[PDB]
Design brief:
It is found in: Cytoplasm; Nucleus; Cytoplasm, P-body; Cytoplasm, Stress granule. The chain is an alpha+beta fold and about 100 residues long. It has a single domain, classed as RRM (RNA recognition motif) domain (Alpha-Beta Plaits). It contains two helices and four strands, in the order βαββαβ.
Length: about 100
C-alpha cells in the first residue's frame, strides 16, 4: 500500500489549497485533482505522501478535519493477498455409539 486519496472536499477547494492541508507541517510532497469535461473541478483528489512513515501519522490527524470545504475523509490504494484454497465445506459430521 502507498499514497492517499481525499473523497469529501468540494470543488471550492483545489490543488494549491490541497497542498497546504499537508504542507502545514513545514515541508511539501505532491498532489493533484481531475476536472470534469465542463471545467468545474471536484475537490476530491489524490495526494502523493512524504513517506509511509508520516502517512499513517497524518491519516489519524486529517480524517475528520475541515479546511476550505467540508469535513474531509481519507482513503488509500490498500493491497490484495488473502487467497482462497477450499476454506469451507457442505457435508455432515457426527459420532454415535454402535456395535
Amino acid at each position: 500500500g502507498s499514497e492517499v486519496i481525499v473523497k469529501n472536499l468540494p470543488a471550492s477547494v483545489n490543488w494549491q489549497a490541497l497542498k497546504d492541508i499537508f504542507k502545514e507541517c513545514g515541508n511539501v510532497a505532491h498532489a493533484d485533482v481531475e476536472l470534469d469535461g465542463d471545467g468545474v473541478s471536484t475537490g476530491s483528489g489524490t495526494v502523493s505522501f512524504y513517506d509511509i512513515k508520516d502517512l499513517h501519522r497524518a491519516i489519524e490527524k486529517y480524517n475528520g478535519y475541515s479546511i476550505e470545504g467540508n469535513v474531509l475523509d481519507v482513503k488509500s490504494k490498500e493491497s490484495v493477498h488473502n487467497h482462497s484454497d477450499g476454506d469451507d465445506v457442505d457435508i455432515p459430521m457426527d459420532d454415535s455409539p454402535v456395535n
